[PDB]
Design an enzyme around this catalytic site. Structure first.
Site, PDB file in Angstrom:
ATOM      1  N   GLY F  26     -24.704 -16.799 -64.905  1.00 22.28           N
ATOM      2  CA  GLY F  26     -23.789 -16.086 -65.651  1.00 22.28           C
ATOM      3  C   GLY F  26     -22.493 -16.574 -66.001  1.00 22.28           C
ATOM      4  O   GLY F  26     -22.334 -17.928 -65.817  1.00 22.28           O
ATOM      5  N   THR F  27     -21.479 -15.824 -66.377  1.00 21.91           N
ATOM      6  CA  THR F  27     -20.301 -16.352 -66.624  1.00 21.91           C
ATOM      7  C   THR F  27     -19.577 -16.790 -65.271  1.00 21.91           C
ATOM      8  O   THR F  27     -20.012 -16.791 -64.174  1.00 21.91           O
ATOM      9  CB  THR F  27     -19.211 -15.147 -67.126  1.00 21.91           C
ATOM     10  N   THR F  28     -18.416 -17.642 -65.495  1.00 24.83           N
ATOM     11  CA  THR F  28     -17.577 -18.030 -64.653  1.00 24.83           C
ATOM     12  C   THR F  28     -16.495 -17.699 -64.043  1.00 24.83           C
ATOM     13  O   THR F  28     -15.650 -17.087 -64.798  1.00 24.83           O
ATOM     14  CB  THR F  28     -17.176 -19.771 -65.020  1.00 24.83           C
ATOM     15  N   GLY F 158     -20.323 -19.313 -61.404  1.00 30.82           N
ATOM     16  CA  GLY F 158     -20.872 -18.730 -62.493  1.00 30.82           C
ATOM     17  C   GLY F 158     -21.014 -20.115 -63.188  1.00 30.82           C
ATOM     18  O   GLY F 158     -20.288 -21.107 -62.845  1.00 30.82           O
TER      19      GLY F 158
END
Ligand SMILES: [Mg+2]
Lengths: 238, 239, 198, 247, 241, 240, 198, 198, 198
Positions: F26-28, F158
């Protein structure tokens, strides 16, 4: 596979459970004083982004009982909690503070129950409890995931068990008593670090380690600074 | 695809089907009605006979003074149904004064056989059953059959259990749909001969129980049933 | 244990992605050498299809092709055996976990494996190209169809080259792809950084 | 493989798991017990993991009631907790109803009742331990009892369970008569236990106790006639090795 | 659909799970019960033998269920004790409620109904026991009943269960006069029993007995579970060393 | 290897690894403990021009003093937050004093803990960063699917965690005395941009929050507005 | 039982990791002997590829190679059979548990097994190298292609050497790796210290 | 049923561990007889590798070896067939339980089985050792390579002995081990003392 | 249906355990006939191993053995086919239940089956015993090894007898056991008394 007897009655989930205790990668040793007790554990901080305060494998369960665990931090914090509260509930329900040897019983008891009824997977940690109660003094009892405890005059948990062990054993066939002759803890502490350094073919700075001491009813964790000064102490005298 | 609480591609619940396969495994029952009676016939698996004649069981069972039933399949099961029915038979009368309607009864029974085919972790009653009797303050003979799945059905005369297919055929071209067997005497005469296919001689394997209105009821004795085998083999030889 | 690791070490240390990258790269442009071995045999089937009858004596241009082909099978097989070597050296300790990486290794080995097998049902056809003709050129004493069978044993063997070449290109290209995708899994099959639980 | 694993009937009639439980039994430590006309004796080997564990803190022969003690062979842990509940049931389901303590026979059965539960039920593996319960009570006299994880139990004169049973059960079989007094037994026990060892044979490395006679000392009180003392006697490290003299 | 689970139904309406258990019986000691127009007999041959086992201040085959009813076991030891217990309880509720002795027919029935219970639900396995019920009630007099794990019960003139009860069975079919006074039965018992044994010969120790009888001098019913002695003796009376 | 409860031949719970594997995917997200208080930031990914900006907030407050963010499975994150929300508010009602960050983590760790014990449940699919203040200073931790967490000087998970990691590394040494409350933000603003260079073809929206007795005043406030802008531009210059 | 263990004992006692360590070590540097058996056959295909026609009579340098090769196959196979012997002696009591260690042993045996098979499809090619030529050198009375087939039966057999050698190196190296990793499991397949539960 | 058991009885009664103990023991020291059949064929390949050409006539020392080897295969096979006999007589009533013991029996049979197969791909090579030479010694009228093929067909067959012997030792030793461990399970495959439940 | 059962009836009625008991019993003592066919061929290999060279003409004592052996295979095979017949007649109505009994039948058939196969790879070796010698006795015009190959083709065929005999004894014995245990299941494979539920 799963929690119910093998063909030779040895349900491996309990066995497998063990490797994982070990797997963490830290060495825990413990020995009795005369009016105190001590445990050694390594404090390897890899990630330069963490904070050594937040690290540790030893916690203050009670006013006088401490605990060390060679095992995975998530599962430990659990055991830590329950135990921490069993004693809390005890003193209340019975009038007197709960001793080492006993907690380790409901503790092993607990891990047995789980195991047999199947209400959860066993925690992959070995708990090593320490303190000094005015009924048996310097006490040291250990417990494993296969729900089971017993007594040690001085013990060790780790990837390299028997080494730390054999040393103490040999040092024991000679000292001939079943504990460490000496009055001051500082002095005993010195002794263990000693017997561990010698035992790893390794040296430790003032943060590479982790140690605790159980006194006459006032258990405390050894902190960063005081910790170093014992290395000072045991440098020349060697 | 057999361990049912799930569907076959063609929409079957094979377990419920198989269960019926046991009713066939079991003994045999047959019911018939007139314009005054309803007779229930059954056979007797007289196989390991070194057992007291006296107290050992017999297919037909009274559920209330005016109603009875019979089965075929697992005895082990059957008993439990009979009990639960008998109970509901009173629970009604209590909470409603009025004694049970035969249609209602069956519906209850079928509701139970039906209950044992929904929750996983239970198995269907290996029992199909014939229920006969006359409604309270009523003179119209009623015959119903219930089976394992939960279906109930009213018949003019029906048969269940092993070789039902046969006797069924027989019945089919004997029982007049237009007019039912008038007299009781002959209504019996009928049922008796219809069982003589599977019996294999001897009124010692034939049970008869007869039910009239106004809660009358009455099982049959061996000779009585015999005096029929007699008066039938006679007209068979006369043909 | 000190000495034991040193061997497993100096071995994996003398072959690597660094090495394999050159086979993929080497057998990348080298397909030209095959896209060539093709067109050659083609131009040749026309002369055999139409170069009516004769009185025999071993065709020089034909052996020029088989020598060039048998020549290529040789290169490739050695080049593959090199890739194979790089992998067999990375097969981790046998057990029943992390076998995701290991699986890749095996699957790729089976395809490489196939390539090598392909280069061996025809990578000998020269010593076999002239192996049916000593039987064919004999019986020198005449079926007017036997004369024609010689016309064929020449063209037939030229077809086998064109065809083996066609398939071969495909096999190679497949292998190129296959490697380029997985590879990292091929060298690093277990990770083991999952000690974030202990 | 088979129709083993799970709690259900094998084609013949053999119940699955149960037998593998009676396996953790046979594999376990060696233990015995002898009923002997004026006393009863139960013992088991104390094979120490390592000499760094002060094994002096783990009973194998344990006190169930001041007239009954028992012992095991198999899964250590199972015995530890099994005992505690066992003690309670001897209270809640007897002493609190009657005022006194229960006879051997019944307490055993009560323990067996628990041993039972663990079976008839999926989601729970039985106990990997067989118990040797020895006791006494004013009306049935001296008793000896074995209890398998299968719930079932039997009344013995003497026997063994564990690694060295095939053998021991034979040695015991030879050396038994109905007039033997306790010390005869006690002696006899050791000599059986003798063979069944691989480690040592000193005091601290043998766990043994016995049901003998009233210990008016042990009570702590004095003034009540009928209340005289426990019979259960766990022989300590000392009393033992001394009896090693007459072999 | 094959073997596993009790809730399963094979394509032919068979409950294997049961049929195994219903057969598991063929592993237990041979128990026999016989009827006479004056008393009922329960005979049984012990199992689990060695030489270091008592049996006097205990039993495990003949259990007294009511002052008027008795049963012969033949199955799983563990099972039996559970049913035996709830069978005793219920019998007492009948007494506590109607203030009268519970009829044998009834009692047998209720038990057969629990065994049957475990025959139809998931999460539990059927009991692997078989019982020879023997008793009396003034409703239908003396009665000999039997029941398997299938939950079916049966009225018998004289029956056997357990081991070789096909062999043992037929021996009975021969000698049996309906009136056959008790002693002839007690006698017959052994005759039938001896003939069906793997022991070199019939020894008292490995054997269990009991009888039921009533009259005018008793006015009520009396039953006796025979003690070690009486047996070692009547055995001799039937001509056995 | 297929069930959640089970162990591998040498003590290993695979379902948790995959849990981790999804957390990375997923995102960071990041966070930084500074002078007094903390600073967080996440990576909202604008997948289309039909997304209202300044809208779908991924960062959430707890009580009125705890910042909090994560990445991996978004609904899992949200869920976990709720439990944390009860625990907090219950405690508060009980002890009166707002909940100590040190313990808070455990309360959550203990809850994430459980979902590794039974097979009928699914492991928590998110790594979570958070912190806040109290009496004895500000703290910051990071909880993983395994339930194991700790205190860091700054955290990250992430997609690209290393970018921000080595990035966080530097700060330590040049400012071994805690970075300025203010500079903390604008610095975070940059550390994100740098780590975004994977979703580079796809534009995005940066979100920031922080805590500080001096700036926020003990509380947790959303960095939005004016300070928010310059903090971006600040990043935008170093972005070369 | 006293005597029974003694045999199983004195047998495992005369072979060990101590022994196998030397095969891995021995067949470590010994690859040079193969990296050599390679370059020899290569230099030789050039003389056959170009050493135009003749009138026959058995080539001395060629048999010098097959003798050197067939010579190596021999060594290796004996050396493998020794490693194989060390393992078969450690196969524990057959049952359905702890089969993790046992599994390793089998897997490794299958790979060793393969090695041995490889040394036998060519470890006889000398008595076969000169086996097609007595048929080829005969028919001494002339296909001008038969003369060339003799040029080929010389070069073809030189190729087989170079190739078998190439693959062989790989197999060996693979085996080296495979052993070095597992091994401890190979000798100690069951542990049994798990009695910490009883 | 009385008579029926008597047969099954008097049969198992004339073979037992008592019998098999002697094969394990007999085929224990008897390996020397093989460690010998080895060194003999070795000393012999050197004379063939170097005992330059000839004019033919059947070598006496060579048949001395094949006779000695074919001699050994014979013994062993009979000795194995005896162990095999001992087990097949103990295969319990076929059913779907207690199959743990039965399984062992089968596994061991498959390994023994193998041993016997091994002694039969070469336990005939004498009637075959001189089977290719009547074809080889004929064509007495000369390939100068055919003369050398006779030098080889002598050495090749000496190699096969050495090699078969090497492997064989291994197989035997494996079997010794395998038996010594299980065995009790082999004779007592079902116990049945489990009636402690009824 | 009336007639239909009569057939299935009168068929099972003319073969039974009564019949099979005699094969087990017949082939019980009859092993002596084999333990003999053994010792005969043995005494005979010594005369061939040492009865130096000759000038040919068909050995009378040898055919005396093959005639005696081929004679035995014949008996056995017929005797087995009878046991086989007894079972195939008892294979119940095909379905998916009670297959426990049926299974036994099949397993036993497969083993019997094997026995028959064994008696057919050698139960013809007489018409084959003298089948390689007409080729061997011809070429009457001399390899001095061809003479020796005749010495071998005699001894080789005497070994095959001894060996086939050894294995055979085993197979039989196995079968004896196997039958004696199961059997009742073989004739009564379904019971069906389980109607105690209805
Ligand atoms: Mg679970």
């Amino acid at each position: 596979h799963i929690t119910i007897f093998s063909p030779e009655g040895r349900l491996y989930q309990v066995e497998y459970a063990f490797k994982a205790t070990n797997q963490t990668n830290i060495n825990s040793l413990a020995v009795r004083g005369k009016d105190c007790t001590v445990v050694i554990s390594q404090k390897k901080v890899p990630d330069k982004l963490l904070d050594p305060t937040t690290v540790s494998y030893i916690f203050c369960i009670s006013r006088t009982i401490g605990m060390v665990v060679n095992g995975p931090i998530p599962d430990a914090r659990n055991a830590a909690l329950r135990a921490k509260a069993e004693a809390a509930e005890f003193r209340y329900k019975y009038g007197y503070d709960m001793p080492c040897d006993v907690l380790a019983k409901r503790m092993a008891n607990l891990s047995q129950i789980y195991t047999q009824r199947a209400y959860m997977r066993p925690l992959g940690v070995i708990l090593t409890f320490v303190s000094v109660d005015e009924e048996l003094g310097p006490s040291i009892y250990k417990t494993d995931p296969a729900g089971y405890y017993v007594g040690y005059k001085a013990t060790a948990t780790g990837p390299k068990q028997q080494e730390i062990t054999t040393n103490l054993e040999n040092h024991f066939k000679k000292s001939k008593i079943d504990h460490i002759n000496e009055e001051s803890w500082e002095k005993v502490v010195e002794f263990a670090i000693t017997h561990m350094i010698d035992a790893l073919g390794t040296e430790f700075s003032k943060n590479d380690l982790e140690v605790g001491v159980a006194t006459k009813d006032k258990f405390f964790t050894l902190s960063a600074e005081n910790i170093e000064e014992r290395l000072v102490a045991i440098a020349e005298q060697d | 695809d057999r361990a049912l609480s799930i569907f076959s591609p063609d929409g079957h619940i094979f377990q419920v089907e198989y269960a019926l396969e046991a009713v066939k495994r079991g003994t045999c029952a047959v019911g018939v009605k007139g314009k005054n009676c309803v007779v229930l016939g059954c056979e007797r698996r007289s196989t390991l006979k070194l057992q007291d004649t006296r107290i050992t069981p017999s297919k037909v069972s009274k559920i209330d003074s005016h109603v009875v039933l019979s089965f075929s399949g697992l005895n082990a099961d059957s008993r439990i149904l009979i009990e639960k029915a008998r109970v509901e038979a009173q629970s009604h009368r209590l909470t409603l004064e009025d004694p049970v309607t035969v249609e209602y009864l069956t519906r209850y029974v079928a509701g139970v056989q039906q209950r044992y085919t929904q929750s996983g972790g239970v198995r269907p009653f290996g029992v199909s059953t014939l229920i006969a009797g006359f409604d309270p303050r009523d003179d119209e003979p009623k015959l119903y059959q219930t089976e394992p799945s939960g279906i109930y059905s009213s018949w003019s005369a029906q048969t269940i259990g092993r070789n039902s297919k046969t006797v069924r055929e027989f019945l089919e071209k004997n029982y007049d749909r237009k007019e039912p067997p008038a007299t009781v005497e002959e209504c019996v005469k009928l049922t008796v001969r219809s069982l003589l296919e599977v019996v294999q001689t001897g009124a010692k394997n034939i049970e008869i129980t007869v039910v009239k209105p106004d809660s009358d009821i009455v099982a049959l004795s061996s000779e009585e049933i015999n005096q029929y085998v007699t008066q039938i083999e006679q007209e068979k030889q006369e043909q | 244990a000190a000495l034991i690791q040193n061997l497993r070490d100096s071995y994996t240390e003398t072959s690597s992605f660094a090495v394999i990258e050159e086979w993929a790269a080497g057998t990348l442009q080298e397909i030209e050498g095959i896209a060539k071995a093709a067109a050659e045999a083609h131009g040749v089937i026309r002369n055999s299809t139409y170069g009516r009858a004769q009185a025999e004596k071993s065709p020089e241009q034909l052996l020029g092709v088989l020598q060039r082909y048998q020549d290529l099978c040789h290169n490739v097989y050695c080049q593959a055996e090199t890739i194979r070597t790089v992998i067999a050296i990375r097969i981790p300790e046998h057990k029943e976990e992390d076998n995701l990486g290991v699986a890749v290794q095996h699957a790729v080995l089976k395809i490489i494996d196939e390539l090598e097998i392909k280069t061996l049902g025809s990578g000998e056809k020269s010593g076999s190209g002239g192996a049916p003709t000593p039987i064919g050129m004999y019986a020198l004493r005449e079926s007017p169809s036997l004369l024609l069978e010689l016309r064929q044993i020449d063209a037939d063997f030229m077809l086998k080259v064109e065809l083996a070449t066609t398939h071969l290109s495909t096999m190679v290209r497949a292998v190129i792809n296959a490697y380029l995708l997985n590879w990292k899994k091929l060298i690093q099959p277990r990770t083991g950084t999952d000690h974030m639980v202990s | 493989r088979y129709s083993f694993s799970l709690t259900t009937f094998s084609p013949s009639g053999k119940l699955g798991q149960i037998d593998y439980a009676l396996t953790a039994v046979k594999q376990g430590v060696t233990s015995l017990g002898i009923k002997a006309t004026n006393g009863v004796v139960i013992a088991t080997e104390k094979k120490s993991s390592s000499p760094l564990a002060m094994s002096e803190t783990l009973s194998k022969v344990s006190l169930l009631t001041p007239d009954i003690g028992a012992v095991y062979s198999g899964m250590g842990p199972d015995y530890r907790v099994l005992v505690d509940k066992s003690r309670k049931v001897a209270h809640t389901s007897y002493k609190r109803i009657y005022g006194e303590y229960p006879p051997t026979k019944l307490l055993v059965s009560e323990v067996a009742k628990i041993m039972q539960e663990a079976t008839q039920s999926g989601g729970v593996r039985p106990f990997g331990v067989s118990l040797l319960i020895a006791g006494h009570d004013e009306f049935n006299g001296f008793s000896l009892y074995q209890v398998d994880p299968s719930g079932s139990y039997f009344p013995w004169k003497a026997t063994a369970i564990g690694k060295g049973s095939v053998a021991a059960k034979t040695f015991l079989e030879k050396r038994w008569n109905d007039e033997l007094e306790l010390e005869d037994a006690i002696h006899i026990a050791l000599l059986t236990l003798k063979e069944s060892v691989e480690g040592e044979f000193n005091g601290d490395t043998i766990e043994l106790a016995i049901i003998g006679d009233e210990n008016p000392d042990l009570l702590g009180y004095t003034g009540i006639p009928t209340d005289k003392g426990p019979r259960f006697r766990k022989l300590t490290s000392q009393e033992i090795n001394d009896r090693l003299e007459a072999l | 659909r094959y073997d596993s689970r009790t809730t399963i139904f094979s394509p032919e309406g068979r409950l294997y799970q049961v049929e195994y258990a219903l057969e598991s019986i063929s592993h237990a000691g041979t128990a026999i019960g016989i009827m006479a127009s004056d008393g009922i007999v329960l005979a049984a041959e012990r199992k689990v033998t060695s030489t270091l086992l008592e049996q006097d201040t205990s039993t495990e085959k003949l259990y007294k269920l009511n002052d008027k009813i008795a049963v012969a076991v033949a199955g799983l030891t563990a099972d039996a004790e559970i049913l035996i217990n709830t069978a005793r309880i219920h019998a007492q509720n009948y007494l506590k409620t109607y203030n009268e002795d519970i009829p044998v027919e009834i009692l047998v029935r209720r038990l057969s109904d629990i065994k049957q219970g475990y025959t139809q639900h998931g999460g539990l396995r059927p009991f692997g026991v078989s019982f020879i019920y023997a008793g009396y009630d003034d409703r239908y007099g003396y009665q000999l009943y039997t029941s398997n794990p299938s939950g079916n019960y049966t009225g018998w003139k004289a029956i056997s269960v357990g081991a070789n009860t096909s062999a043992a069975q037929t021996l009975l079919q021969m000698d049996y006069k309906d009136d056959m006074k008790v002693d002839d039965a007690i006698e017959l018992a052994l005759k039938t029993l001896s003939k069906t044994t793997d022991s070199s010969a019939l020894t008292y120790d490995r054997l269990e007995f009991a009888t039921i009888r009533k009259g005018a001098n008793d006015g009520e019913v009396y039953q006796k579970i025979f003690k070690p002695q009486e047996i070692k003796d009547i055995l001799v009376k039937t001509g056995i060393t | 290897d297929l069930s959640n409860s089970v162990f591998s031949p040498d003590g290993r719970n695979f379902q948790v690894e995959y849990a981790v594997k999804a957390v990375e995917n997923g995102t960071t997200s990041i966070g930084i403990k500074c002078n007094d208080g903390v600073v967080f930031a996440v990576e909202k990914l604008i997948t289309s021009k039909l997304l209202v900006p300044q809208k779908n907030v991924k960062i959430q407050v707890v009580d009125r003093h705890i910042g909090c963010v994560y990445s991996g499975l978004i609904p899992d994150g949200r869920h976990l937050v709720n439990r944390g929300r009860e625990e907090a508010a219950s405690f508060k009602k009980l002890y009166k004093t707002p909940i100590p960050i040190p313990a808070f983590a455990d309360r959550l760790g203990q809850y994430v803990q459980a979902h590794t014990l039974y097979n009928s449940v699914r492991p928590f699919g998110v790594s979570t960063i958070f912190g806040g203040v109290d009496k004895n200073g500000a703290h910051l931790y990071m909880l993983e699917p395994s339930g194991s967490y700790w205190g860091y000087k700054g955290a990250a998970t992430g997609k690209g965690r290393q970018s921000a990691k080595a990035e966080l590394e530097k700060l330590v040494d040049h400012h071994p005395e805690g970075l300025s409350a203010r500079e903390a933000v604008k610095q975070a603003a940059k550390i994100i941009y740098l780590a975004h260079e994977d979703n580079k073809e796809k534009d995005f929206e940066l979100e920031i929050s922080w805590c500080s007795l001096s700036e926020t005043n003990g509380l947790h406030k959303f960095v939005k507005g004016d300070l928010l802008q310059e903090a971006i531009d600040f990043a935008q210059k170093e972005i070369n």
